[PDB]
Amino acid sequence: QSACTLQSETHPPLTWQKCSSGGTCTQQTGSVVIDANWRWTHATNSSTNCYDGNTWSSTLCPDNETCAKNCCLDGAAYASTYGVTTSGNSLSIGFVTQSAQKNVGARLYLMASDTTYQEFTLLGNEFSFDVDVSQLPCGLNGALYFVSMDADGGVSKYPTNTAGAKYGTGYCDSQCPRDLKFINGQANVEGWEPSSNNANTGIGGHGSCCSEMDIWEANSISEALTPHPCTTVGQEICEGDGCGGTYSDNRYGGTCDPDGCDWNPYRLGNTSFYGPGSSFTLDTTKKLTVVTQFETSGAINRYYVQNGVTFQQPNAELGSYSGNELNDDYCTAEEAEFGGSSFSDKGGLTQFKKATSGGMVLVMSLWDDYYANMLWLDSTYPTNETSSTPGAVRGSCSTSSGVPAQVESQSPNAKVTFSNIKFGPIGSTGNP
Ligand SMILES: *[C@@H]1O[C@H](CO)[C@@H](O)[C@H](O)[C@H]1NC(C)=O
Ligand SMILES: *[C@@H]1O[C@H](CO)[C@@H](O)[C@H](O)[C@H]1NC(C)=O
Ligand SMILES: *[C@@H]1O[C@H](CO)[C@@H](O)[C@H](O)[C@H]1NC(C)=O
Ligand SMILES: [Gd+3]
Numbered sequence: 001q002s003a004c005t006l007q008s009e010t011h012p013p014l015t016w017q018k019c020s021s022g023g024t025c026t027q028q029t030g031s032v033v034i035d036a037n038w039r040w041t042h043a044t045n046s047s048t049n050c051y052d053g054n055t056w057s058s059t060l061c062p063d064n065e066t067c068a069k070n071c072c073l074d075g076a077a078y079a080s081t082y083g084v085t086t087s088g089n090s091l092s093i094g095f096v097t098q099s100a101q102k103n104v105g106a107r108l109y110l111m112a113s114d115t116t117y118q119e120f121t122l123l124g125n126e127f128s129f130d131v132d133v134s135q136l137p138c139g140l141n142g143a144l145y146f147v148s149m150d151a152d153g154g155v156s157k158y159p160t161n162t163a164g165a166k167y168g169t170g171y172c173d174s175q176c177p178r179d180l181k182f183i184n185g186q187a188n189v190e191g192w193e194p195s196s197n198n199a200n201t202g203i204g205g206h207g208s209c210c211s212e213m214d215i216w217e218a219n220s221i222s223e224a225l226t227p228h229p230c231t232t233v234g235q236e237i238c239e240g241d242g243c244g245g246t247y248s249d250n251r252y253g254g255t256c257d258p259d260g261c262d263w264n265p266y267r268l269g270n271t272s273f274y275g276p277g278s279s280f281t282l283d284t285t286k287k288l289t290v291v292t293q294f295e296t297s298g299a300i301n302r303y304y305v306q307n308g309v310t311f312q313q314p315n316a317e318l319g320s321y322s323g324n325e326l327n328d329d330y331c332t333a334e335e336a337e338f339g340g341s342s343f344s345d346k347g348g349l350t351q352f353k354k355a356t357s358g359g360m361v362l363v364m365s366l367w368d369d370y371y372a373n374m375l376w377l378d379s380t381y382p383t384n385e386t387s388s389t390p391g392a393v394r395g396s397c398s399t400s401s402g403v404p405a406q407v408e409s410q411s412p413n414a415k416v417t418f419s420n421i422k423f424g425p426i427g428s429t430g431n432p
Pocket of ligand 1 (some may be wrong): 044045069070071
């Protein structure tokens with residue numbers, strides 16, 4: 001697709017800190033851009049919609065190539081349409097915003113320039129941020145994560161995409177998402193199946209796969225840390241059912257690991273570690289600092305800070321594993337005790353180190369879950385199991401509280417605020 005300018009595109013600014021092993025941090029001035037799927041897609045020379053509700057125009061978009069020639073992405077009114085604001089080093093993402101249409105959440109990328117995403121090399125480095133999850137009930141996910149996207153949004157590889165990173169093109173993740181309207185500079189109208197439960201979304205014939213480091217998927221009840229390897233490290237189109245992920249009949253049927261090697265303290269039996277109020281170690285009614293280190297072995301270390309008090313990731317005992325580091329032993333013990341083979345079949349922490357040794361793009365988002373109702377994060381899951389099934393209980397939420405119709409009507413002013421991003425060598429993000 002191309003870009004149109006019926007609405008001007010002004011990327012909300014966002015500062016962050018780049019830290020050095022020399023004992024200092026220096027402020028960077030970046031900006032954020034909303035993903036192209038959230039934008040108005042219309043004809044290049046009129047206000048006629050290419051996509052509206054959850055169907056495409058038959059005349060403008062008869063096939064994937066024709067649609068991309070005929071259609072453009074427009075600008076975003078960040079605050080009034082999407083409930084997205086920034087304030088210095090802080091980014092606020094709102095949940096439901098009713099304007100002319102219903103908007104639900106947003107997915108945003110950190111930019112390095114008007115036309116490029118900021119790339120981070122995570123291996124041997126650490127990433128720190130602060131987060132307020134107090135306004136995120138059961139069913140929501142305020143996510144901060146990294147994906148192996150191209151820095152330019154795909155423009156150099158797929159020159160039929162001229163909108164680029166300036167308009168939030170190029171998304172991929174370990175779910176091989178098929179709900180994307182544009183992939184590889186073509187539309188995704190071929191095979192488009194409107195969602196029966198969502199008047200604004202559907203599933204197309206193609207998807208967009210890549211490695212995903214979920215630093216933070218969380219709400220006020222539960223939080224999880226999860227690397228997802230893929231057999232191709234970076235962005236790759238997939239076809240139909242071959243995609244696997246959330247949007248295919250068989251989630252395990254593709255090139256990416258949709259489950260990952262996850263560490264959720266509640267799931268591991270530490271049920272007083274993270275939650276709302278004074279009975280929890282980390283009180284989710286207040287802002288929290290989350291620090292994540294990518295050790296050179298491929299292991300991942302985690303600690304937290306709240307009200308000036310530091311807490312390491314709590315220890316877990318799982319089978320023969322005892323410790324508090326997300327490492328090979330943990331991920332092996334997790335598959336043994338809880339089940340699954342997708343993480344190890346996709347190459348585990350060794351294949352994952354290929355992603356973190358390269359560049360990844362920072363993503364911040366808020367979403368509800370029309371497919372699994374976030375029960376994997378904060379409830380008992382899978383829902384054919386019981387509390388006695390090892391690893392089934394991940395939080396205290398009810399089965400039905402994360403149904404989108406419920407959370408969108410009950411908690412429309414839910415929101416997440418991410419702030420004070422700092423990045424640098426291991427041990428450097430506490431620097432002034
Ligand atoms: C708008 O652009 C299309 C090509 O995408 C062109 O075929 C169409 O006729 C144009 N509209 C006019 C001339 O009104
Ligand atoms: C949970 O973690 C905290 C570590 O901050 C600790 O004080 C508490 O003993 C742990 N509870 C468990 C392992 O059940
Ligand atoms: C739950 O369903 C999964 C697959 O959908 C199956 O592997 C498992 O055996 C089922 N367990 C029970 C207890 O029904
Ligand atoms: Gd260590």
